[PDB]
Design a protein around this ligand. Structure first.
Ligand SMILES: Nc1ncnc2c1ncn2[C@@H]1O[C@@H]2COP(=O)(O)O[C@H]3[C@@H](O)[C@H](n4cnc5c(N)ncnc54)O[C@@H]3COP(=O)(O)O[C@H]2[C@H]1O
Ligand SMILES: Nc1ncnc2c1ncn2[C@@H]1O[C@@H]2COP(=O)(O)O[C@H]3[C@@H](O)[C@H](n4cnc5c(N)ncnc54)O[C@@H]3COP(=O)(O)O[C@H]2[C@H]1O
Ligand SMILES: Nc1ncnc2c1ncn2[C@@H]1O[C@@H]2COP(=O)(O)O[C@H]3[C@@H](O)[C@H](n4cnc5c(N)ncnc54)O[C@@H]3COP(=O)(O)O[C@H]2[C@H]1O
Lengths: 104, 103, 101
């Protein structure tokens, strides 16, 4: 496997809005984070979103989380019902353990 | 930071279900305040469409989410054509989560 | 209530492979009785299609599944431009429980 002795990888599963996905992807690339992206849909709104799977060494988790925050952070937008302020953007991130990482 | 209180644990549920049951599962998850993200997937053996749900849940609600999945997507008998067939079925993985964040 | 015998452990294999190798990997998984669910994905760098396989496997068959992936997708590098793109990237992840309903 590719993990040095005593170190650990994590799997980041980040669910972000489609409007922020290209900017996140560009920033992950710029910071040399590898990603795989999935076109997904939310259970509540049933609208398209984007899920990123990023395998990262534990020592770069805080950095990836800051990239995701800077690009996909929650913010307000005025909309008209049927002008009110609503939350848009935002990221939901799971950090999961990885036992091994291989490249063939 | 992270959304998990000290000493508690989250789990990630990966549920692979049939396409015909996916809308009822999604409705029931919503009704019970479970969040989900869904993926259109295909099976390795039959190469036919199915649906994969990713649900991050607190450990204390795992049994509850499993029961919702079972009730809505469990394997069962159905008359068609009148012939009896097996329909539905869910495969579920419960996986550990180190941290959970919202930004 | 799960499918995992007492004292044993399941793992989730997440294998990201190129679309050109996907069908042959799928056939070999099937032939060796490995279950897989496939996801149509795209790479973060090249933004081009690839395939992600999720395979829940008992720990005692992890080395075998890795050797299937290697035999089918390994030594399969190609240079491309939007860059070495490998045969397979595989994560082995822990699973607490496994259920069929
Ligand atoms: N039962 C409920 N009651 C009241 N409000 C509800 C609700 N379910 C969802 N919402 C609201 O709807 C937003 C979009 O949820 P959706 O399921 O379409 O789209 C979600 C979903 O695809 C994913 N997600 C969030 N938490 C998740 C989890 N625990 N597991 C899996 N996916 C999750 O992230 C997207 C953004 O979620 P976020 O939490 O930022 O934003 C949520 C939340 O503000
Ligand atoms: N350990 C695991 N890891 C990842 N994904 C998993 C999994 N177990 C199940 N799945 C997913 O769940 C679907 C339903 O599988 P199930 O075992 O209910 O129902 C299966 C099973 O009854 C049968 N089957 C699958 N592979 C087989 C094999 N090698 N030999 C005999 N029967 C097989 O065909 C059905 C459809 O399989 P298919 O592959 O098309 O579709 C699968 C697959 O997408
Ligand atoms: N740690 C990880 N987490 C999640 N997914 C992962 C991953 N490592 C690899 N992948 C997935 O596997 C595909 C093939 O990766 P590989 O590293 O062989 O081949 C890579 C690598 O040789 C190169 N590459 C990727 N990012 C790079 C960067 N920032 N700088 C230079 N080369 C890069 O581009 C190839 C294609 O990358 P692409 O992103 O389109 O597609 C990737 C991505 O979808």
């Amino acid at each position: 496997g590719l993990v040095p002795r005593g170190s650990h990888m994590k799997m980041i599963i980040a669910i972000v809005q489609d409007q922020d996905s290209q900017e996140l992807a560009d920033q992950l690339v710029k910071n040399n984070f590898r990603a795989t992206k999935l076109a997904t849909t939310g259970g509540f709104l049933r609208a398209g979103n984007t899920t990123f799977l990023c395998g990262v060494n534990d020592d770069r988790v805080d950095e990836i989380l800051s990239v995701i925050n800077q690009t996909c952070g929650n913010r307000e937008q005025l909309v008209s019902p049927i002008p009110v302020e609503v939350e848009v953007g935002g990221a939901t991130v799971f950090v999961m353990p990885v036992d091994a990482f291989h490249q063939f």
